[PDB]
């Protein structure tokens, strides 16, 4: 049931960077291992990935710079709740 989401305002999308959100009680050690498993699976398919940040405290997960071609693979990772493409915010 892991799903993908991207901004409905197409000019505000920031393709190429994704927030992988894990299930509520996922521990930091499990988030780090899931990020490393994504990098390894992506490399077996010939893709580079960069883990920009690993989240813990409010939402477990990580921020990854990678091709969106890897999204079907990433949604099958352990603990994944959903994946969102990064997008812009503006001063009001």
């Amino acid at each position: 049931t892991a799903t993908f989401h991207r901004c409905a305002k197409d000019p505000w999308r920031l393709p190429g960077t994704y927030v992988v959100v894990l299930k509520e009680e996922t521990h930091l050690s499990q988030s780090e291992r899931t990020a490393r498993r994504l990098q390894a699976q992506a490399a077996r398919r010939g893709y580079l990935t960069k883990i920009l940040h690993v989240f813990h405290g409010l939402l477990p997960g990580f921020l990854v710079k990678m091709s969106g071609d890897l999204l079907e693979l990433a949604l099958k990772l352990p603990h994944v709740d959903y994946i969102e493409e990064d997008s812009s915010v503006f001063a009001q």
Partner: protein, 289 residues
């Protein structure tokens, strides 16, 4: 004798001299001119910065321009002369670049930094001001909902798109206090061809047109600004004052106090689209007596 907005939030000169002193207000915004006389010593600049690169290869990063938005908002909250809660301490995080643009990921990392900071060195009640908006974001809404559930009060701008606030984030997060903007005639603010957002995701309105506040052009300069960011900053200041007077308030109780003390039925609902009139709260924020 007094800025219109400070008179408007006073129940019928600006009196409270050290309001909101038990509360810490976190500001996720542009860089700030921390030595401006209006906010010097009141705002502590954290080491946090997560911003996208400016658009245009020949951008000039002038400090007066880069710091404009954040400096004015810090002044509205706690400014020496023109602030709402003159005793509230502020902590600033930089998530908007010189053009006022940020990312949902940078905002998420910033919200995490606030929670980590609190766990390491707890102080009194916290109020987080998010004077920013993007499209509806499941992840940004979830992060705000989790920080609110952890006991932190979040206040955000409704957005300046003359549209339903439910289509934007963090405006659409129900656990966040979402603030629209009204003017000196208590009417919704027009901003060019757009203006304040409205609808069921807005909790209340607050002064947001021609708001005097600190200008980053010089250390003693003041300038008027308009927008839902300024309206949200008024509610962050009012919340800091209510929480400092009654520190045991839960988020639900605080929301009830904001509604109870607001001026009611002063907005002409004809400005909003027909179907949004019954869904938009006709409330303009005010301090308790």
């Amino acid at each position: 004798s007094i800025p219109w907005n400070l008179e408007r939030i006073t129940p019928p000169e600006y009196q409270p001299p050290d309001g909101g002193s038990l509360v810490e207000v976190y500001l996720l915004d542009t860089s700030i001119q921390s030595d401006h006389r209006e906010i010097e010593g009141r705002v502590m600049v954290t080491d946090f910065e997560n911003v996208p690169e400016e658009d245009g290869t020949r951008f000039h990063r002038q400090a007066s321009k880069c710091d404009s938005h954040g400096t004015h908002l810090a002044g509205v909250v706690s400014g020496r002369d023109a602030g709402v809660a003159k005793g509230a301490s502020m902590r600033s995080l930089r998530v908007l670049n010189c053009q006022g643009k940020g990312t949902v990921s940078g905002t998420l990392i910033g919200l995490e930094f606030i929670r980590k900071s609190q766990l390491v060195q707890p102080v009194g009640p916290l109020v987080v001001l998010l004077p920013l908006a993007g499209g509806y974001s499941r992840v940004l809404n979830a992060a705000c909902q989790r920080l609110a559930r952890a006991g932190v009060v979040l206040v955000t701008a409704a957005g300046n798109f003359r549209d339903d606030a439910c289509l934007y984030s963090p405006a659409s997060a129900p656990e966040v206090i979402t603030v629209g903007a009204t003017n000196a005639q208590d009417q919704p603010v027009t901003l060019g061809t757009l203006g304040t957002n409205f609808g069921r995701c807005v909790d209340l309105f607050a002064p947001g047109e021609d708001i005097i506040g600190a200008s980053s052009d010089c250390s003693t300069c003041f300038v008027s600004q308009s927008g839902t960011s300024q309206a949200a900053a008024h509610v962050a200041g009012i919340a800091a004052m209510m929480l400092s007077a009654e520190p045991e308030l839960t988020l639900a109780e605080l929301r009830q106090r904001l509604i109870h003390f607001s001026a009611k039925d002063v907005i002409n609902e004809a400005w909003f689209p027909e179907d949004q009139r019954v869904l938009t709260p006709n409330l303009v924020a005010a301090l308790p007596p």
